[PDB]
Amino acid sequence: VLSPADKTNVKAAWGKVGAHAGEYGAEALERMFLSFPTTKTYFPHFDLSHGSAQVKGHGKKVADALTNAVAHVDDMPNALSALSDLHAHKLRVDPVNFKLLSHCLLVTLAAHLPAEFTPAVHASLDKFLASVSTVLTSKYR
Amino acid sequence: VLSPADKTNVKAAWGKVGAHAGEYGAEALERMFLSFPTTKTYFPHFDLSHGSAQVKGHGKKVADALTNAVAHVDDMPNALSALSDLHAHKLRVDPVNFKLLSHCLLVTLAAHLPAEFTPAVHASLDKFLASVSTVLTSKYR
Amino acid sequence: VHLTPEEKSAVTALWGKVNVDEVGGEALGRLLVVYPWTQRFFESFGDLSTPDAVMGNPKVKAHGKKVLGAFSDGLAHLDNLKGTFATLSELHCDKLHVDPENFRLLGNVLVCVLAHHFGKEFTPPVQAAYQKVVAGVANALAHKYH
Amino acid sequence: VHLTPEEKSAVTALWGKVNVDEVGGEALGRLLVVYPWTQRFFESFGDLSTPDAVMGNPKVKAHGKKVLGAFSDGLAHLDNLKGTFATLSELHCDKLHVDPENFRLLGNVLVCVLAHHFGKEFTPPVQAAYQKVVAGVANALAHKYH
Ligand code: HEM
Ligand code: HEM
Ligand code: HEM
Ligand code: HEM
Ligand SMILES: COC(=O)c1ccc(COc2ccc(OC)cc2C)cn1
Numbered sequence: 001v002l003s004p005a006d007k008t009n010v011k012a013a014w015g016k017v018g019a020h021a022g023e024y025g026a027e028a029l030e031r032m033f034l035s036f037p038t039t040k041t042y043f044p045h046f047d048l049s050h051g052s053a054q055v056k057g058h059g060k061k062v063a064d065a066l067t068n069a070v071a072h073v074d075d076m077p078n079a080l081s082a083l084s085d086l087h088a089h090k091l092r093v094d095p096v097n098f099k100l101l102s103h104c105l106l107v108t109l110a111a112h113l114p115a116e117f118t119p120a121v122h123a124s125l126d127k128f129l130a131s132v133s134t135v136l137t138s139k140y141r
Numbered sequence: 142v143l144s145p146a147d148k149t150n151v152k153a154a155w156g157k158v159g160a161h162a163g164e165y166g167a168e169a170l171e172r173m174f175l176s177f178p179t180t181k182t183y184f185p186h187f188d189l190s191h192g193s194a195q196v197k198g199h200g201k202k203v204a205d206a207l208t209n210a211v212a213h214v215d216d217m218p219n220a221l222s223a224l225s226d227l228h229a230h231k232l233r234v235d236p237v238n239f240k241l242l243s244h245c246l247l248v249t250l251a252a253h254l255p256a257e258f259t260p261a262v263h264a265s266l267d268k269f270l271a272s273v274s275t276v277l278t279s280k281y282r
Numbered sequence: 283v284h285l286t287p288e289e290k291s292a293v294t295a296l297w298g299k300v301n302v303d304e305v306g307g308e309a310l311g312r313l314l315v316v317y318p319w320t321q322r323f324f325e326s327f328g329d330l331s332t333p334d335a336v337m338g339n340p341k342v343k344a345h346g347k348k349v350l351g352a353f354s355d356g357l358a359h360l361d362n363l364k365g366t367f368a369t370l371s372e373l374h375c376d377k378l379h380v381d382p383e384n385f386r387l388l389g390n391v392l393v394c395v396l397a398h399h400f401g402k403e404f405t406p407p408v409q410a411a412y413q414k415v416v417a418g419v420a421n422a423l424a425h426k427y428h
Numbered sequence: 429v430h431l432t433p434e435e436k437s438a439v440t441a442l443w444g445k446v447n448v449d450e451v452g453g454e455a456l457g458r459l460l461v462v463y464p465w466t467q468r469f470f471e472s473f474g475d476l477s478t479p480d481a482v483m484g485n486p487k488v489k490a491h492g493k494k495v496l497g498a499f500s501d502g503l504a505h506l507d508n509l510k511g512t513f514a515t516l517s518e519l520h521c522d523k524l525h526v527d528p529e530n531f532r533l534l535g536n537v538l539v540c541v542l543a544h545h546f547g548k549e550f551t552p553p554v555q556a557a558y559q560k561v562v563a564g565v566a567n568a569l570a571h572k573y574h
């Protein structure tokens with residue numbers, strides 16, 4: 001459950017990503033694949049080599065979905081219904097992997113947006129990603 | 142996030158608790174304190190002896206809160222706001238402890254309501270108590 | 283490798299009354315239903331599309347029996363859980379890469395199933411003793427992670 | 429833990445640049461802010477009532493420096509982490525009863541702080557090496573639970 005301040009913090013901070021959506025998204029995935037190799041088992045059909053192309057394109061999709069989540073922060077189960085079907089009923093992703101990717105997203109934002117990444121904004125982004133994660137792993141349909 | 146079927150299951154099963162509210166509440170508390178003794182440190186000035194009137198009283202309070210949650214399953218952050226103030230802001234309860242009580246609540250329901258504690262209802266009750274726990278542990282004011 | 287003498291006695295006394303052919307299957311089945319991502323580890327087991335399909339799946343019941351056999355092995359060696367589950371730890375951690383939290387989930391599901399079956403006989407002290415067992419089994423299985 | 433010599437060189441080069449006066453305090457501080465329940469272990473540290481209060485708290489900065497120092501000793505003894513943290517493990521587990529998940533949380537907060545401080549120098553391969561370290565340290569602290 002996000003506070004009104006949580007929502008404000010997340011919108012201000014994520015809105016700084018802008019045209020760097022694909023870059024940051026791809027970087028967050030790369031960090032995940034490298035730091036926690038077991039997450040690669042969810043992408044066996046992917047080219048997961050360094051840089052690739054498939055990864056960079058997928059990173060853009062991930063970042064754009066977060067942008068959408070931000071814009072529908074009060075209606076995420078509806079807005080993320082398609083992704084919930086994918087990650088929860090079809091892929092059956094273990095929730096632990098969402099914590100791994102969420103941490104890697106935080107790391108990426110801290111590395112690229114130091115002025116945005118205050119302790120309070122860090123706390124809000126963490127809750128936001130936690131909430132998105134819960135939605136994507138719940139079978140609520 | 143609860144599915145319509147989850148909400149149906151939770152209302153039906155908790156409805157069957159009925160007048161056994163205080164009894165099951167107190168039992169879950171005593172199971173927690175005994176199985177997981179570190180949880181006792183959240184109640185430093187309590188009489189936590191077996192059969193304690195104070196624990197009886199508190200179990201009724203916890204059970205009634207859940208009944209309220211069930212009755213407002215679609216409006217829980219609003220309904221539980223004061224409870225969130227207490228657990229999240231004042232007490233700052235470690236979310237792991239909510240997992241412990243939630244499990245003990247399930248154990249108590251299973252021990253008392255064998256016919257109703259089906260795998261599907263078990264699953265729905267688990268998600269419900271997880272959702273309640275999330276609401277109680279987050280500062281959204 | 284604690285468990286008080288009284289905890290060991292209580293655990294041993296209850297386990298003698300446990301139906302070794304049913305309980306493991308119930309626990310595994312409920313794991314798959316309550317925590318549906320765990321189904322990903324059992325894709326060859328066939329139909330897991332509904333609770334009824336899971337709980338009536340022969341392969342789930344058969345595998346549960348092996349699982350409960352390992353718990354029985356733990357309970358007959360309460361002071362050496364680490365050694366008892368060493369090989370299973372390699373399988374679950376090094377090969378299957380099951381996240382250790384799932385070990386705790388299965389443990390607590392087993393405890394719900396024991397409650398469900400024994401009712402009031404599954405008293406708080408009996409539960410407390412069993413929580414030590416399933417915590418010990420979970421840590422032993424996660425040993426190769428340590 | 430197993431770092432490659434290349435990984436080891438990258439970790440040590442970065443660590444040698446770390447501001448030992450602030451980085452530990454910022455990691456502990458953010459832990460207390462992002463996961464407020466951890467404040468329950470530090471009631472004697474005075475004002476933790478706001479984020480600004482937490483980060484600026486002299487006791488938080490001082491204690492964080494000790495935390496950083498423990499990570500430094502970890503880095504200097506990667507072949508014997510369980511021995512190095514033996515004392516700390518008995519403190520954190522037997523005395524403080526800190527839940528093991530919190531160890532992991534702090535380790536990852538440290539990583540965020542390193543990212544925060546070093547920016548692009550904190551590359552994905554550098555992070556991956558540091559994730560091995562904080563996992564190793566965290567496990568070593570919890571190991572009197574095992
Ligand atoms: C944490 C927030 C996450 C978000 C916002 C997110 C978002 C997305 C999006 C937008 C897609 C593309 C859907 C499409 O257009 O077809 C996708 C696909 C996918 N995701 Fe995620 N994801 C998240 C976490 C994860 C995690 C933790 C994993 C596994 C470790 C994962 C594994 C996958 C896989 C296997 C696909 C299908 C890839 C393909 O074959 O096209 N996702 N996700
Ligand atoms: C389903 C989860 C929970 C529910 C529904 C719940 C509900 C409640 C309720 C209704 C009260 C009384 C509020 C009042 O005074 O009017 C209360 C108080 C309290 N709860 Fe919880 N609670 C839950 C979980 C927990 C957990 C897991 C802990 C700690 C391990 C905890 C610790 C406390 C404490 C310390 C108090 C105050 C007791 C006092 O008066 O000093 N609660 N809770
Ligand atoms: C925590 C207590 C657990 C115990 C005591 C246990 C025990 C066992 C045993 C005895 C086997 C048979 C291995 C063999 O004969 O080669 C097995 C296999 C297996 N276990 Fe577990 N297990 C536990 C938890 C889990 C969990 C939580 C998962 C996943 C969520 C899991 C996934 C598997 C899989 C995929 C296999 C191989 C099944 C196959 O043949 O396809 N186990 N386990
Ligand atoms: C995960 C890595 C951690 C490391 C490396 C670490 C390191 C340390 C060190 C070096 C000390 C000083 C011990 C002494 O001077 O004898 C200490 C004390 C302490 N730690 Fe940690 N710590 C960690 C995690 C945690 C966590 C997660 C918590 C609580 C949420 C915690 C709570 C405490 C407390 C309460 C003290 C004593 C403070 C006092 O003297 O009042 N530690 N830790
Ligand atoms: C607002 O629409 C909803 O019904 C709804 C329901 C559930 C959620 C998920 O909420 C979570 C989940 C995890 C979490 O960890 C901190 C926090 C929240 C608010 C988000 N939205």
Ligand SMILES: COC(=O)c1ccc(COc2ccc(OC)cc2C)cn1
Nearest residue numbers: 001142143215216217218268271272275
């Ligand atoms: C108005 O209702 C809400 O906005 C709202 C928001 C968040 C939540 C929490 O949702 C959770 C949290 C944890 C969880 O674990 C299984 C499941 C759910 C649905 C519940 N309700």
